Amino acid sequence: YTFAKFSTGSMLLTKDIVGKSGVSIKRLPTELQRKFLFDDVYLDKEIEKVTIEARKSNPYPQISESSLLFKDALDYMEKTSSDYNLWKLSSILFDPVSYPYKTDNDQVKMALLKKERHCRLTSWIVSQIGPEIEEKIRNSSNEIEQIFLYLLLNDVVRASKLAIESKNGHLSVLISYLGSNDPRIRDLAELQLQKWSTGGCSIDKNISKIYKLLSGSPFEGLFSLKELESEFSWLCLLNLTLCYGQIDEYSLESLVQSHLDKFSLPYDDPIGVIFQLYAANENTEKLYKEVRQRTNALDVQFCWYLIQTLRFNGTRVFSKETSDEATFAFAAQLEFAQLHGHSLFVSCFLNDDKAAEDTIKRLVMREITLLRASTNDHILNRLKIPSQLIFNAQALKDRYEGSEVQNLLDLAEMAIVTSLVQNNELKTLREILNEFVSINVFEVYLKLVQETIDSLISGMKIFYVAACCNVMSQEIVSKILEKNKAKLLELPLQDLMKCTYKI
Amino acid sequence: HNELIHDAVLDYYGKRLATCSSDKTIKIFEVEGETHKLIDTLTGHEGPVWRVDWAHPKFGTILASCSYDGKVLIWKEENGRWSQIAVHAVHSASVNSVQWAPHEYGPLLLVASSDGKVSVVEFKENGTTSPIIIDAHAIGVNSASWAPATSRKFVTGGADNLVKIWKYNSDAQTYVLESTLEGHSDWVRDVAWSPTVLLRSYLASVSQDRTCIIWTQDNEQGPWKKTLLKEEKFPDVLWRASWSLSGNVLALSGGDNKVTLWKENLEGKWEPAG
Numbered sequence: 001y002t003f004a005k006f007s008t009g010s011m012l013l014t015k016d017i018v019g020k021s022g023v024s025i026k027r028l029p030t031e032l033q034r035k036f037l038f039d040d041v042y043l044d045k046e047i048e049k050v051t052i053e054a055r056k057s058n059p060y061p062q063i064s065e066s067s068l069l070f071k072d073a074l075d076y077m078e079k080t081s082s083d084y085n086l087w088k089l090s091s092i093l094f095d096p097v098s099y100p101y102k103t104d105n106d107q108v109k110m111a112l113l114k115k116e117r118h119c120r121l122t123s124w125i126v127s128q129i130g131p132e133i134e135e136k137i138r139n140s141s142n143e144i145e146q147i148f149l150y151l152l153l154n155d156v157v158r159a160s161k162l163a164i165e166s167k168n169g170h171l172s173v174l175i176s177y178l179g180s181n182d183p184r185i186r187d188l189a190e191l192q193l194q195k196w197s198t199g200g201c202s203i204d205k206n207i208s209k210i211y212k213l214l215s216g217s218p219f220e221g222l223f224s225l226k227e228l229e230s231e232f233s234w235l236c237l238l239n240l241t242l243c244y245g246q247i248d249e250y251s252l253e254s255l256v257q258s259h260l261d262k263f264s265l266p267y268d269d270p271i272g273v274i275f276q277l278y279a280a281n282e283n284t285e286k287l288y289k290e291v292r293q294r295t296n297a298l299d300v301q302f303c304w305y306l307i308q309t310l311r312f313n314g315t316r317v318f319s320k321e322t323s324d325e326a327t328f329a330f331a332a333q334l335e336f337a338q339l340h341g342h343s344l345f346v347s348c349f350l351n352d353d354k355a356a357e358d359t360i361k362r363l364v365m366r367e368i369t370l371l372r373a374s375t376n377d378h379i380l381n382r383l384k385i386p387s388q389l390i391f392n393a394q395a396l397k398d399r400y401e402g403s404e405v406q407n408l409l410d411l412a413e414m415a416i417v418t419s420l421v422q423n424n425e426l427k428t429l430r431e432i433l434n435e436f437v438s439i440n441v442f443e444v445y446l447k448l449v450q451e452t453i454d455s456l457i458s459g460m461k462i463f464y465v466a467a468c469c470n471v472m473s474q475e476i477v478s479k480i481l482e483k484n485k486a487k488l489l490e491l492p493l494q495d496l497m498k499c500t501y502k503i
Numbered sequence: 504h505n506e507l508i509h510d511a512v513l514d515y516y517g518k519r520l521a522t523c524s525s526d527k528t529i530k531i532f533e534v535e536g537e538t539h540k541l542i543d544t545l546t547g548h549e550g551p552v553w554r555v556d557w558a559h560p561k562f563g564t565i566l567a568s569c570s571y572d573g574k575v576l577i578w579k580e581e582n583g584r585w586s587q588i589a590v591h592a593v594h595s596a597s598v599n600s601v602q603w604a605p606h607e608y609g610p611l612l613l614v615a616s617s618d619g620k621v622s623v624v625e626f627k628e629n630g631t632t633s634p635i636i637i638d639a640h641a642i643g644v645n646s647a648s649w650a651p652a653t654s655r656k657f658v659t660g661g662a663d664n665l666v667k668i669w670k671y672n673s674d675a676q677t678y679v680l681e682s683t684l685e686g687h688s689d690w691v692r693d694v695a696w697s698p699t700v701l702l703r704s705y706l707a708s709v710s711q712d713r714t715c716i717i718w719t720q721d722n723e724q725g726p727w728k729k730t731l732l733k734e735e736k737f738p739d740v741l742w743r744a745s746w747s748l749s750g751n752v753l754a755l756s757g758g759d760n761k762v763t764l765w766k767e768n769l770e771g772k773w774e775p776a777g
Contacts (some may be wrong), residue, residue: 003510004756005745009517012745012754014762015508021532021539022508022522029777293769328701332750343749358700362748366515400516400560411561 008366010336032333034083034301036076040376043342046072052384057353060360061384066312068305069095085128086270090306092120093278094315118242118252125239126154132233144168144206151178151213152236154243171207177214181248189214193223216246219262226262234265234272253281270297277306284316304330308349320351331359340367341380348383360385365393404428408435416440420467439464443471451482455491469495476502510554512566521566523552529568529578531585547587548572553599559606567612569598575614575624591624591632600646604655613657615639615647621659621669623678637678640665643690650696650704656681658706660691666708666718686729688712697746705767707753709744713737715755717773732765732773752776 004014016024036042049072051065070091077084097116103109130153137149143166150159156178163172177185189211196203209225212218218225218240228237241259250258257279265272273291280287288307291298298306304326310316311323327349334343344363350356364371364385371377381390388409395406407415408431416428429444439461446454458475462468476498482488492502511522520532520539529552531543550571558565564580565588574592578585592598594616604611604623612624619640625633639647640661647659655671657678664687672679689711697705706718706727713736718727732755743756753765753773765773 001507001509001742002756002758002760002762003508003743004754004762005512005743006747006752006754007513007517008515008748009513010747010749010752012762013511013513013520014756017506019539020541021511021520021530021534022505022524023511023520025534025536025539031776289769335749355700369516396560397516399563400514 009338027338028336030333030337031300032337032339034299036073037301037334037337037339037342039076040341040374042076043345044376044379047345047379047383052348054384055353055356058357059384059386059388060353060357061348062351062353062356063312063349066308068309068312070305070309071095073305086274086302089124089271090274092117092124093274094306094309094313096313096315114252118247121252122154122239122242125235125242129153129233129236129239132236142206144171144204144210147171147175148206148209151175151210152232152239154179154239171210174214175210178244179247181216181246185214186216186246190217197223213240213244216244218244220258229263234263237263238275253279257281267295268297270295273297281316284310285318285322288318289322300326300329300333304346304349323349324351324355328355328359335363340370341377344371344380344385345383361389364389365396368393368397412437413440417467420470452491455479473498509551512555512557514557514564515560519557519564521555521557523555523568523570525551527552527570529555529566543585545578545585547576547578548574550597553597554601556601556603558603558610561606562610565610567601567603569601569614569616571597573598573616575601575612577612588630589626589632591622591634593622593634593636594618594620596643599644600648602647602649604649605651608655613647613649615644615659617643617662619643621647635677637669637680639667639669645690646693648694648696651698651700653700656696658694658696660694660708660710662690664689664691664710666691666694666706666716682726684708684718684727684729686716686731687714692740692742693744695744695746697751698748699746699751701751705746705751707732707744707746707755709741709755711740713740713757715741715744717753719771730772 002015004012006012011028012026013023014026016022046068049067050063052061053064054060055062070087073087074084074091077087097113099109099112099116103112133149133152137146140146140149143162147159147162147166147168150162156175160172160175163169163175193208193211193215196208208223212221212223212225215221219237225237225240238256238259242255245255247255256275260276260279265276273295277284277287277291307318307323307326311318327346331343331346334346340363344360347356347359347363350359368390371380391406391409395403398406404415404419408428425444425447429448432441439457442454442457443461446457458472462472472495479488479491505524508522508524511520513520518534520534521529522532523529527546527548527550529545530541531545532539533542548568548570552568552570555566555568558567566578567575568578569575573594573596574590575598576587577589577591579588591612591614594614596617598614598616600613600615602613604613610626612622614622614624619638619642620636621639621644622634622636625635627633639659641663643662645660645662647657650656650658657669659667659669661667664685666684666686667680668682668684669678670681687708687710691708691710693709695707697707699705703722704720708716708718710716715732717730717732719730720727737757737759739758741755741757745754746752747754751767755763755765757763764776766776768774
């Protein structure tokens with residue numbers, strides 16, 4: 001026999017006869033695997049980037065402005081880790097670029113921004129493929145092949161130089177065109193390729209490759225580099241499309257898409273996934289959903305951060321429901337990690353006001369104690385946690401730990417029972433007057449101090465345990481003080497012993 | 504010496520644990536990571552205490568326990584000294600489950616005994632009990648779980664292999680049965696309603712025939728949907744089945760000495776996690 005249920009503080013108790021209690025307090029294994037999340041500084045700086053506004057259907061906080069960028073996380077990760085690569089590439093493709101210098105008109109600006117982004121993306125890809133290709137250049141035994149490989153590292157100049165040196169001068173000249181998108185040269189190169197590929201008794205295998213690069217369509221083609229699929233990182237070939245490929249006529253997205261249309265990427269590879277989401281443009285969400293059911297390369301946190309960035313930067317569009325789905329998931333992972341402040345913060349990115357309300361409330365009340373320690377916890381409850389919720393929750397924690405100012409802002413009668421000094425009574429009376437059960441009010445009014453009415457009130461209260469007996473005794477003492485007569489005798493007409501002593 | 508505890512419960516804030524065993528005693532502990540210091544022992548039952556369950560702290564410190572002696576015993580800590588304030592034994596056999604309602608319903612209790620009965624014990628103004636009972640299952644009731652909601656309902660797991668969904672009715676004043684569900688070949692050990700106020704509602708129904716059916720209702724209308732968690736019998740009979748608040752994770756206590764954990768994916772089907 002075994003038993004196990006989930007805790008309030010979502011964790012699990014199971015039969016365990018090795019412990020002292022006969023159960024085990026198990027810290028539920030958290031999927032949330034990303035170090036900087038357990039450090040509260042990240043969360044503070046992350047709240048500094050947000051503008052919280054109350055809802056238009058309830059007072060609960062939800063995010064109005066976010067300046068979160070894939071860029072921002074990079075400081076908290078190792079520049080060596082593959083993760084850093086994911087977040088970086090994501091920054092390059094999705095975070096807005098700024099172009100500081102003034103531009104005659106705004107379509108030029110758009111064009112420059114496109115060039116900038118393109119240049120950074122292609123420098124990055126070259127960063128990645130770098131060692132692969134350098135290895136390949138190490139092992140080549142043929143100069144023209146090396147020239148090609150240098151083009152694989154988008155180093156037009158070293159290719160040109162090697163050409164020069166290896167006595168391939170014409171080639172050298174041709175190479176210098178790589179990265180200008182001169183359509184004349186494009187169609188000329190293609191022409192030369194057709195002429196060879198119609199007779200052309202023999203042309204060097206790599207010279208043709210280089211011409212194919214000048215053609216602007218190195219796979220898209222009839223002398224195709226597609227077979228290099230088996231010799232190079234998919235990223236390397238994508239580099240080829242992006243650098244040569246036809247930069248000007250296409251947008252970055254539809255270009256990348258063009259490439260992806262020619263090559264299936266491995267389902268599991270996440271930098272692949274990011275390129276696919278980038279290129280998918282018109283239906284990112286569609287793809288994102290597809291990506292969800294196919295792979296786990298994108299984690300809960302990442303998917304949430306992504307969706308949120310794209311949402312708050314106009315970059316892309318996601319359903320209220322998909323954004324909320326992601327948000328729920330990450331908030332939950334966080335709560336499983338006992339990271340309640342952080343889960344709360346994330347919980348605020350909910351679109352569904354009803355759900356936000358419930359989630360937030362539930363968590364705050366259940367976990368108020370931990371959420372009231374430092375200033376990094378203060379800014380927390382100064383997200384925009386409703387005054388009501390905070391104090392209400394605080395009221396509950398006092399009733400259970402054995403409050404009043406809260407209740408002031410049935411149960412009231414129980415509080416009055418617990419309370420049974422004069423100044424406190426007066427303050428309570430003032431609070432009650434501000435709010436305006438009646439019998440207790442009459443009794444209080446009598447205590448502050450007509451006598452018959454107070455008596456009837458006290459009797460009624462008695463009809464409605466130690467505290468009550470004490471109050472009865474006090475009332476008795478007061479009446480005795482008042483008699484010190486016939487009216488008092490008329491009103492009257494251990495407790496039994498006292499009653500006998502009175503008669 | 505504590506070779507076989509049957510149930511344990513944690514309070515709202517998780518500071519005070521309450522285990523209950525077969526020697527009839529209910530031990531209360533002050534938990535703090537490693538060290539749970541024994542603070543109390545409670546002897547008032549005439550048989551193995553099957554289940555314990557704290558109430559919402561809105562009602563102070565109350566703990567309703569149910570034991571083999573057919574009696575439900577309500578306890579309460581009072582200035583640091585425990586005292587059996589009430590009792591409710593209108594059931595002619597061993598009481599199995601006992602679970603408080605959502606605190607919005609009042610202080611309602613949900614008892615479920617082998618005499619095929621399930622009660623909802625209100626505690627009036629005098630603190631006295633206001634029992635309104637119903638017949639739930641033929642050959643006996645193993646469990647009964649509450650449902651949260653914003654039209655109250657609960658679920659019951661039977662010894663006739665049924666899983667019933669009852670709802671309150673002002674016309675009847677007694678909970679009227681609204682839907683029963685059939686899918687097990689042996690005593691339905693435990694039933695659990697999920698606290699997920701999400702697009703749909705989830706029920707995990709563990710059973711003796713080593714199955715765990717999941718009844719996912721689309722919404723308020725369209726009936727439930729049968730989904731055998733996995734389609735292979737678990738190595739041994741399953742006992743308990745609990746939902747998580749944040750996340751909709753499912754914990755399964757099989758008689759195979761580990762607890763498995765199952766999460767829903769975008770297929771709608773369920774996958775292990777741990």
